[PDB]
């Protein structure tokens, strides 16, 4: 098909209302992989973490799969746009593209 | 024209470049109502910014966005900046360039994020970040000397010789007016008065600003405290309660001189100045001793210049006379320096353009400036 | 031998130095007959002191001599001291030295007056005043740790490292069992039971001591309070009335954890411990976290140690496991420390002599001891 | 039998002559209790010496007896020496001769006083003082070469040809590991971590010893700093806090190479080595380039030997190859040279004797030896 990347599960597109909360996640197959969340090409979400954005990382022993989560709360209209998820491993680099839309 | 904003802890100073005094000065506090209100027709106003908080202080809980020269929460800062421009200045950032002030030995993240918020949160054609010690020096009108900069946030020392910088010689000291306030509230309890709330915490700060002073000699005033006649003064609270303080008032300012009372190893403000000078080269040491400049919010208390003068002279060689210049309105000197800096023709090319930021990114701040 | 008296709000603990437990323990209350009695042959007894008051509680109005670690009325204290020596101890102050315990961050006047009353009101060859947190540590036998001392009067935190104490690190919290009692009486009214009298005010305190416990998780027990088969218990009053409480009793202890219910800004007991630790140096922090000691009247309720352990571990880094030592008879630990302290040979030299007091004056208490 | 003591800033190395490894090694620090502790039965102990100070580091304030190869306070040194002979060695100076090591270009007063303390404070039949660079050479077992000696105190260069020493060619450099530590603590603040206390100052030094390394190419690693994958390594503090450092970690070692970062005009370690060689004659220069020897506490950082070889070969003509010998356990090499020197038959005749000291006086130290 095409090479199969580091994501068992790719981030998914979603819609969020004003004042609501939306969660996006990425799964990586089994040193632990490092994930960067980007708004546009040059905006790093990790430096944008405050009341509006949270980052959560978890590891599950049973499946040997790492789950990375992006948490958005009180999603303002200003958050509408294109978001890019990048994950790096010992031997591989990979990225995924998804869009967040805020209505109202 | 241009806009200059001085963001030290506890206060926000803002105004237009080319002006002697800032348009608006207010405390840097963000407050939220901790208690539920049971009424109909209330604004609700999730938070209050600036002096608005001071009036409605009892209901609210007060949070300081900047601690020890470090911004703890960025969104609160954004509300403050929003408040400074639209609420008082009544101007658009797009129309005017904006100058911000930075404390010495400050972390990299604070400068990079601050520029990122100004370029994207507010749309500004250009902006610049400068060090607090150098702006005070321009307000003074002197290009050579040593600047002692202390405020609510953190005490900083930065010697200046003919336009050259000496990074090794620059010393950061973790002493501040806010730190003094914690010492002060603690000292009141021994006398039978206790404050455990943030709202009255500022009340002692108000007390400290005018009632507190610096003793010429700590041992001698404390010694004469036995016959407390002139050492006791009555202070009136908004409550209506009356507070009287004696030897307690002068010793709080003493703590800057004596960090031991606070419990920290680091040397006092006068010793730190010596450390910066010792680090510096022998050729430029003689002018620095007589060129001492005092700036910041907590340098206001009377007797600071006089106590520093004897202490610096005592530790230093008697070979050269020691002169300290601490002019009135020293608190506003940093903002004033910013206003003059913006005014100069050469400086405008120097501003970090919006255009430069978009390609290269937030990391250019360290690359372009000091 | 020597005499040791532990004074905290609500209770008096006293006994001979060098013994396992104090000779007599009774509540610290002064009560006067508010109602005029119409009889002949009545003693009249203008005031009643101690447990005697509890027996005749309905007629009398009860006043606590010590509020928030502060003695409101000095002559009431004198009556209780008289009562402790002459009534239960059956000893003369002249014969034995006397040790007293004092709360941290306590006003200067209380220590100076207390010695003045002991030297002149009761004659004694020597006396000494010590801080409550250190004595509790002695009962433990531990030389290093952090002591959480909360009594009926005021909650105090005092970290100790290898016998050395940091004054800056010591934090005073205005939470107490008596404060909890006011909360408790307020909470009972919603159920449908009302107490507006000091005499039955103590009755809820009695209820609080055994019936009230600290929930492992506030949200989960309250959630499970919808169906009550285990939460509700029946308490029998002296009157003969039956009182049943549900989710109401566990939340009273919760307020120490959650000052917000009380309406005060100051952080809960677990946060305060963190504040004290943050103040302390990085090198000594690791031992302090696992050396937590619980002492005082209000630390009696079950589940306190378990709730504190999870909360401290959550806020603190996961790198070091946290140990909290809360042994049984923790309430009497302060007195025990006092009895052991008196017993050591070195300590006796350290006592403030009657002879020293007459020339130098009452002000020497601060000068000599901490 | 004889005793050999290697004294340099930050560490004390001691043992018995004729043995490959020293019996006891500990840091050279004196610490006093800055905070008054309140307890009964405390050992007190006005000062702590050695590793004892490290354990009780938070309460104490640490002062180094030796700065830049210069002893700041003589009494503190005496306590250290007392500590080494009695606490770990468990031997009497009267019974065994004692060998001490001296830094090059050191002022005359330190050598005369050091012998004076040894003969008067501790009774010993004989003692000798030797230069640190020559002892390292003996440990190596090489007759001719150039010795680069850098430690916690001061960097020293001493070229040796056939046992003959050239006084003019000897170069002293003011760069040291302790100096690096100040740079390191200063660099941590930009990241967002601040250390202003001597007790945690040591903690960064601990970090520096294992975490820090020397880049083959400074410019290339810094360039690759943006993609921080392997550059950032986690560190654990006694506090429990976690520290991560990236490009910051390798630049600290760089400072020795680049004094400009520290602001000093004096040239880096590789250029200084060149100056010693330039000073030397044509006949002996060719072997010296191939005979470079590295020794001392701060030379333990990995990559130093590879970078020095690279830099010396580049600056030096291609006409001859450049070999640098930097064996493992180079830090302890000076002590071993001292132990081997004492064991040699010729050396025992060459001892400064107690008998010799008393008639002639302290001034014989310069007269008798180099």
Swiss-Prot record, chain A:
Signal peptide: none annotated. The chain holds residues 151 to 258 of 1274 of the full protein. Belongs to the immunoglobulin superfamily. MyBP family. Residues 3-102 form the Ig-like C2-type domain. Substrate for phosphorylation by PKA and PKC. Reversible phosphorylation appears to modulate contraction. This is Myosin-binding protein C, cardiac-type. It is linked to Cardiomyopathy, familial hypertrophic, 4: A hereditary heart disorder characterized by ventricular hypertrophy, which is usually asymmetric and often involves the interventricular septum. The symptoms include dyspnea, syncope, collapse, palpitations, and chest pain. They can be readily provoked by exercise. The disorder has inter- and intrafamilial variability ranging from benign to malignant forms with high risk of cardiac failure and sudden cardiac death. Cardiomyopathy, dilated, 1MM: A disorder characterized by ventricular dilation and impaired systolic function, resulting in congestive heart failure and arrhythmia. Patients are at risk of premature death. Thick filament-associated protein located in the crossbridge region of vertebrate striated muscle a bands. In vitro it binds MHC, F-actin and native thin filaments, and modifies the activity of actin-activated myosin ATPase. It may modulate muscle contraction or may play a more structural role. It comes from the Eukaryota. It comes from Homo sapiens (Human). Zn(2+) binds at residues 54, 56, 69, 71.
Swiss-Prot record, chains B, C, D:
The modification N6-methyllysine is found at residue 79. There is a cross-link at residue 45 ((Microbial infection) Isoglutamyl lysine isopeptide (Lys-Glu) (interchain with E-270)). There is a cross-link at residue 265 ((Microbial infection) Isoglutamyl lysine isopeptide (Glu-Lys) (interchain with K-50)). It holds the Pfam family Actin. Its EC number is 3.6.4.-. It is an enzyme of class 3 (hydrolase). It is found in: Cytoplasm, Cytoskeleton. One of its GO terms (molecular function) is profilin binding. GO terms for biological process: angiogenesis; axonogenesis; cell motility; cellular response to type II interferon; maintenance of blood-brain barrier; morphogenesis of a polarized epithelium; platelet aggregation; positive regulation of cell migration. Oxidation of Met-39 and Met-42 by MICALs (MICAL1, MICAL2 or MICAL3) to form methionine sulfoxide promotes actin filament depolymerization. MICAL1 and MICAL2 produce the (R)-S-oxide form. The (R)-S-oxide form is reverted by MSRB1 and MSRB2, which promote actin repolymerization. It catalyses: ATP + H2O = ADP + phosphate + H(+). The modification Tele-methylhistidine is found at residue 68. Actins are highly conserved proteins that are involved in various types of cell motility and are ubiquitously expressed in all eukaryotic cells. May play a role in the repair of noise-induced stereocilia gaps thereby maintains hearing sensitivity following loud noise damage. It is linked to Deafness, autosomal dominant, 20: A form of non-syndromic sensorineural hearing loss. Sensorineural deafness results from damage to the neural receptors of the inner ear, the nerve pathways to the brain, or the area of the brain that receives sound information. Baraitser-Winter syndrome 2: A rare developmental disorder characterized by the combination of congenital ptosis, high-arched eyebrows, hypertelorism, ocular colobomata, and a brain malformation consisting of anterior-predominant lissencephaly. Other typical features include postnatal short stature and microcephaly, intellectual disability, seizures, and hearing loss. Polymerization of globular actin (G-actin) leads to a structural filament (F-actin) in the form of a two-stranded helix. Each actin can bind to 4 others. Interacts with TWF1, CAPZB, cofilin and profilin. This is Actin, cytoplasmic 2. It comes from Homo sapiens (Human). The gene is ACTG1.
């Amino acid at each position: 098909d095409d090479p199969i990347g580091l994501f068992v599960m790719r981030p998914q597109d979603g819609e969020v209302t004003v004042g609501g909360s939306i969660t996006f996640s990425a799964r990586v197959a089994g040193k632990p992989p490092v994930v960067k969340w980007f708004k546009g090409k040059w905006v790093d979400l990790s430096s944008k973490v405050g009341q509006h954005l949270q980052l959560h990382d978890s590891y599950d022993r049973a499946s040997k799969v790492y789950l990375f989560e992006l948490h958005i709360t009180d999603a303002q209209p200003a958050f509408t746009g294109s978001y890019r998820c990048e994950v790096s491993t010992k031997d591989k680099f990979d990225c995924s593209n998804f869009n967040l839309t805020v209505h109202e | 024209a241009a806009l200059v904003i001085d963001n030290g802890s506890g206060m926000c100073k803002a105004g237009f470049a080319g002006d002697d005094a800032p348009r608006a000065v207010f405390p840097s506090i963000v407050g939220r109502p901790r208690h539920q209100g049971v009424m109909v027709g209330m604004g609700q106003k999730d938070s209050y910014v600036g002096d608005e908080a001071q009036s409605k202080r009892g209901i609210l809980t007060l949070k300081y966005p900047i601690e020890h020269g470090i911004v703890t929460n960025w969104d609160d800062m954004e509300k403050i900046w929003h408040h400074t421009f639209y609420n008082e200045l009544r101007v658009a950032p797009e129309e005017h360039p904006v100058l911000l002030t930075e404390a010495p030995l400050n972390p990299k993240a604070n400068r990079e994020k601050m520029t990122q918020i100004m370029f994207e949160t507010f749309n500004t054609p250009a902006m610049y970040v400068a060090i607090q010690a150098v702006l005070s020096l321009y307000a003074s009108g002197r290009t050579t000397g040593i600047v002692m900069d202390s405020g609510d946030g953190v005490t900083h020392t930065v010697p200046i010789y003919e336009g050259y910088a000496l990074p090794h010689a620059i010393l950061r000291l973790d002493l501040a007016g806010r730190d003094l306030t914690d010492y002060l509230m603690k000292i009141l309890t021994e006398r039978g008065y206790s404050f455990t709330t943030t709202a009255e915490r500022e009340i002692v700060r108000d007390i400290k600003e005018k009632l507190c002073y610096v003793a010429l000699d700590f041992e001698q005033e404390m010694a004469t405290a036995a016959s407390s006649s002139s050492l006791e003064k009555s202070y009136e609270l908004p409550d209506g309660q009356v507070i009287t303080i004696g030897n307690e008032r002068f010793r709080c300012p003493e703590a800057l001189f004596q960090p031991s009372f606070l419990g920290m190893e680091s040397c006092g403000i006068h010793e730190t100045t010596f450390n910066s000078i010792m680090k510096c080269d022998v050729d430029i040491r003689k002018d620095l001793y007589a060129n001492t400049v005092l700036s910041g919010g907590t340098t206001m208390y009377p007797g600071i210049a006089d106590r520093m003068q004897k202490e610096i002279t005592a530790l230093a060689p008697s070979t050269m006379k020691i002169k300290i210049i601490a002019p009135p309105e020293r608190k506003y000197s940093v903002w004033i320096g910013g206003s003059i800096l913006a005014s100069l023709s050469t400086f405008q090319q120097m501003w970090i353009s919006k255009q430069e930021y978009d390609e290269s990114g937030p990391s250019i701040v360290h690359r372009k400036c000091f």
